[PDB]
Amino acid sequence: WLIKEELEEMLVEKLSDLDYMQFIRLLEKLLTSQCGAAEEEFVQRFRRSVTLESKKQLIEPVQYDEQGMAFSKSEGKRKTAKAEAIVYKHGSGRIKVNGIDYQLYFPITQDREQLMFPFHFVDRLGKHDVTCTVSGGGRSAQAGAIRLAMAKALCSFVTEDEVEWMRQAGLLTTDPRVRER
Amino acid sequence: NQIKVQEKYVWNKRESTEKGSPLGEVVEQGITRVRNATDAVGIVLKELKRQSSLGMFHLLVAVDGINALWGRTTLKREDKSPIAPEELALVHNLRKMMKNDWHGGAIVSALSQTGSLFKPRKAYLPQELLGKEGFDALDPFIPILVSNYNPKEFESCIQYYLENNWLQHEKAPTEEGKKELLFLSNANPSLLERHCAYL
Ligand SMILES: Nc1nc2c(ncn2[C@@H]2O[C@H](COP(=O)(O)OP(=O)(O)O)[C@@H](O)[C@H]2O)c(=O)[nH]1
């Protein structure tokens, strides 16, 4: 709804709280009735836009390799670890970390669960191939960076609703917590 | 009792094994007096490599973690100096069995980085684990690759564990749990067994 101060600006007249409330009540009553054309553009005169839609994750464009296979590349960062992942549209669930199989690059089960989290959240385990390169940081930081990179690359092959579900699950947000001086 | 020695072996001035005695006696002398245990092992090998050539019996030499023989040891002298594998009689006599200078049997071996000395965790190929000396010793040889479970083997192993009621989590018998186990183990038998152990 149009806030009091900008209503004053539109009217070029100072007005109180109670008369603003009365005007808003009348506008709501007009909305409740079967408003026709002139009515709802009249109301739209007094309704601003909430341009804070945070569903603005940038879907990476789909690229094609020389073999004609579709894929998407993305980046991620966790502490000092930085990862870049390529997710293929079709695959058998093979993840290659620095040219090494993920169960060999990540002996600890926690990191493997972190690498699971993105694909499992959207029910496509075993349906994609991942080729990622990670550098810097430690075991957990590298695992988190790779998770973020794979989620951001996997956003391309899922629906917008699934992208939003991943966003609400925290799979597409960079973790800003780092060591403090 | 069927296998018999062809030489007089002298354990000490008082005790000796005469020619024609059963091999078990030698084994007993190694089991009763540990002082002559290592000497008793080599004799056995010396006999088994020889008699098998005559055709008395078929011999199998199954050495697991064979890469230890031509590597390094973590055993020290009293002067804190390193000891080479060839300076051990037990290791020295077992190398003679790996050479293909005898017939009437087969030599089967398996590599292992688990428990290996001075090897990185991800080294599994023959040359990397054996070393130049080990490869030269075993060469020529037939390598056989052992890989992770294929989908059929993975499904059958999980069905075996389920038939033994070894997966107690309610989501394990379902399909989503099977996908999660497959991903977490990547079909590796050992990782799958360890994960299923505590579920
Ligand atoms: N106590 C004892 N051990 C023996 C005797 N003969 C052979 N051995 C052991 O059995 C093993 C047989 O290996 P061998 O053919 O003799 O090779 P070599 O050590 O270089 O001479 C030897 O390494 C000895 O340790 C013996 O007459 N008395």
Swiss-Prot record, chain A:
Cellular component aspect of the GO annotation: mitochondrial inner membrane; mitochondrial small ribosomal subunit; mitochondrion; nucleolus
Cell location: Mitochondrion
Residues the record lists as N6-acetyllysine modifications: K89
KW Ribonucleoprotein (keyword) present: yes
Domain of life: Eukaryota
GO molecular function term, any single one: structural constituent of ribosome
Region forming the signal peptide: none
Keyword terms of this UniProt record: Acetylation, Mitochondrion, Ribonucleoprotein, Ribosomal protein, Transit peptide
UniProt similarity note: Belongs to the universal ribosomal protein uS9 family.
Subunit structure as annotated in this protein's UniProt entry: Component of the mitochondrial small ribosomal subunit (mt-SSU). Mature mammalian 55S mitochondrial ribosomes consist of a small (28S) and a large (39S) subunit. The 28S small subunit contains a 12S ribosomal RNA (12S mt-rRNA) and 30 different proteins. The 39S large subunit contains a 16S rRNA (16S mt-rRNA), a copy of mitochondrial valine transfer RNA (mt-tRNA(Val)), which plays an integral structural role, and 52 different proteins.
Protein name: Small ribosomal subunit protein uS9m
First-to-last residue of the parent protein present: 199 to 379 of 396
Swiss-Prot record, chain B:
Main location: mitochondrion
Catalytically driven reaction(s): GTP + H2O = GDP + phosphate + H(+)
Described purpose of this protein according to its UniProt entry: As a component of the mitochondrial small ribosomal subunit, it plays a role in the translation of mitochondrial mRNAs. Involved in mediating interferon-gamma-induced cell death. Displays GTPase activity in vitro.
Protein name: Small ribosomal subunit protein mS29
Tissue expression per record: Ubiquitous.
Involvement in disorder: Perrault syndrome 7: A form of Perrault syndrome, a sex-influenced disorder characterized by sensorineural deafness in both males and females, and ovarian dysgenesis in females. Affected females have primary amenorrhea, streak gonads, and infertility, whereas affected males show normal pubertal development and are fertile. PRLTS7 inheritance is autosomal recessive. Some affected individuals present with neurologic features.
Description of how the protein assembles with itself and partners: Component of the mitochondrial small ribosomal subunit (mt-SSU). Mature mammalian 55S mitochondrial ribosomes consist of a small (28S) and a large (39S) subunit. The 28S small subunit contains a 12S ribosomal RNA (12S mt-rRNA) and 30 different proteins. The 39S large subunit contains a 16S rRNA (16S mt-rRNA), a copy of mitochondrial valine transfer RNA (mt-tRNA(Val)), which plays an integral structural role, and 52 different proteins. Interacts with DELE1. Interacts with NOA1.
Gene name tied to this protein: DAP3
One GO cellular component term: mitochondrion
Residues the record lists as N6-acetyllysine modifications: K8
GO molecular function annotation: GTP binding; RNA binding; structural constituent of ribosome
EC number: 3.6.5.-
Family affiliation: Belongs to the mitochondrion-specific ribosomal protein mS29 family.
One BP annotation, GO: apoptotic mitochondrial changes
Naturally occurring in which organism (per UniProt): Homo sapiens (Human)
Localization annotation: Mitochondrion
Alphabetical keyword list: Acetylation, Apoptosis, Deafness, Disease variant, GTP-binding, Hydrolase, Mitochondrion, Nucleotide-binding, Ribonucleoprotein, Ribosomal protein, Transit peptide
